[PDB]
């Protein structure tokens, strides 16, 4: 009889599981597929748009956003949940650029965001905060003093450094494909080609310019989201 423990996050299963947190985890699969890959030359983030109507403004739907010029993001889950998460992340990065006047590392970015996360069952919510686990899985990538770095965040608050992680509806299959398609010496161009290959194999529709949002972060330049022409260039090869 699980039913007595799913009601509420502050319950413990006979197997010691957090059923509310597990449901939040599974709620990630409701979101669109997001794939990020880490290479020596940088990190690239590929996502699916899942456009509901051609009359939609594609700029509104945001699967990848900028927390700071040196770092990038990817989302899978509730739009508003991730909106609060990203706003907090940007506020935190400016907090660091205020306190230490430096660019704060991506591992610390996911540290602070996970600090905002996993706070659902915390008494400090008296002013007002999450009474429910945050329902978005986060993909953080960028370049810091340790070179290019990509971190995947779990709505439970867990983070892990991942060379190539896939979140969203097709996380299992995309991860399985990335398992054999990834090599350590992969160049940025061939990595992005492989990422769009995985998206093509995974996405429910054909790949056009309005089906993919593409992002890149390299030590040289700042965060660049691929424009329409850059997206066409990177998709015409595939």
């Amino acid at each position: 009889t699980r039913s007595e423990y799913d009601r509420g996050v502050n319950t413990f299963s006979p197997e010691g599981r957090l059923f509310q947190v597990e449901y939040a985890i599974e709620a990630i699969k409701l979101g669109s597929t997001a794939i990020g890959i880490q290479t020596s030359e940088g990190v690239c983030l590929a996502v699916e748009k899942r456009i509901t109507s051609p009359l939609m403004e594609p700029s509104s739907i945001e699967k990848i956003v900028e927390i700071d010029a040196h770092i990038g993001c990817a989302m899978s889950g509730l739009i508003k949940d991730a909106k609060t998460l990203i706003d907090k992340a940007r506020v935190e990065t400016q907090n660091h650029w205020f306190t230490y006047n430096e660019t704060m590392t991506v591992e610390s970015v996911t540290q602070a965001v996970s600090n905002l996360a996993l706070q659902f069952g915390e008494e400090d919510a008296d002013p007002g905060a999450m009474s429910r686990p945050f329902g978005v899985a986060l993909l953080f990538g960028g370049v810091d003093e340790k070179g290019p770095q990509l971190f995947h965040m779990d709505p439970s608050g867990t983070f892990v450094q991942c060379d190539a992680r896939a979140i969203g509806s097709a996380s299992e299959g995309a991860q399985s494909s990335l398992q054999e398609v990834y090599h350590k010496s992969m160049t940025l161009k061939e990595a992005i080609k492989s990422s769009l290959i995985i998206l093509k194999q995974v996405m429910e529709e054909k790949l056009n310019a309005t089906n993919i949002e593409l992002a890149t972060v390299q030590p040289g330049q700042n965060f660049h989201m691929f424009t329409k022409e850059e997206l066409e260039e990177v998709i015409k090869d595939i």
């Binding site: 699969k29 509806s169 097709a170 299992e172 299959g173 194999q201 995974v202 429910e204």
Partner: protein, 391 residues
Amino acid sequence: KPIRALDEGDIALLKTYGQSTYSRQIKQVEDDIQQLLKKINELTGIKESDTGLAPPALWDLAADKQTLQSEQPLQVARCTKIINADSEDPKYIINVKQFAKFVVDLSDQVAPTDIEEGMRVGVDRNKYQIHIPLPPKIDPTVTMMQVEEKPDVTYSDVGGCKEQIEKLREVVETPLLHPERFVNLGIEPPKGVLLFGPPGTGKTLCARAVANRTDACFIRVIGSELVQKYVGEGARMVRELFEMARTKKACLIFFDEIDAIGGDNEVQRTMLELINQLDGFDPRGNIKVLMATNRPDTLDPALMRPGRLDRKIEFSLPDLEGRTHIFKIHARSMSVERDIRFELLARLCPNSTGAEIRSVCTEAGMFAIRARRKIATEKDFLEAVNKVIKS
């Protein structure tokens, strides 16, 4: 406003004035049309029903009279307890269907060794003496039984049950095809296994596949079959099935939808007969029992006792790799393109039972037929899974 009832003049004027000039002949003609249909129906006749009369020169009408005047009919009955006969109480209580029950003594043409409880026996009218035992006979055309010696489904046609099929391998392949290992390990081979899981999971199909690959004939025992009309003598029916399994080199006895039997007077007689044919029958035999139900707990507690049912096996819903594998195995028999992203379909149908996936493939074929295309596209599969899945 007080609305006036239409007067007789008003009825008369409504019937005319605002009428087509052909109302009269049209209505009259249609009335005669219906009348003529009724006349044709009433006088067309019925035609002779053709009773079962054999072609001439086949009839022995003289000997027919001889039999009708000499040979006598016998009522048939479900014989019961022998009253502990010992040749001084040859009477048995016998049940003539919905008629009463009678204690009756044998005819001189029969011997008590040929009569035991539970069998159908022909009894005379005058004294109700059992005149001849009538075995219920065994025939694949009657009942619904094994009707299979080498099922056409192999391990290829079953997918998404890898741990499931591996446990089944442990259950059946190791004792049947490698008896020496349990001989020199001094361990009794598994005596009974229950394959419990939700409907449409593949229990029946996995059992049939393992039957094909175990070089043993598959047995199909539908429960509602012997809950319905073929009840009662079903004990002797399964008795004969098990006996032929003894004669057969190896049978894979699986009782389909045992939810219908495990959940009881003749039902209890039956499962105690299997008590005699697993407990009484040696546990070493090659006719191992296979149990599969939609309701696991429904099976009587005396059945799964240690020394009757060694294992219990859970058939869960197929996973992502399982769902894509069943999609492939079901679309192999279908006209589709060679670039169907089956992984996409498996992803799009979460927590979907195997029957739902086969119905999805069927609906994809239906959508392909709808557009009168000989080859189904990925689009057809997408709309089919939009239709079946999500209900």
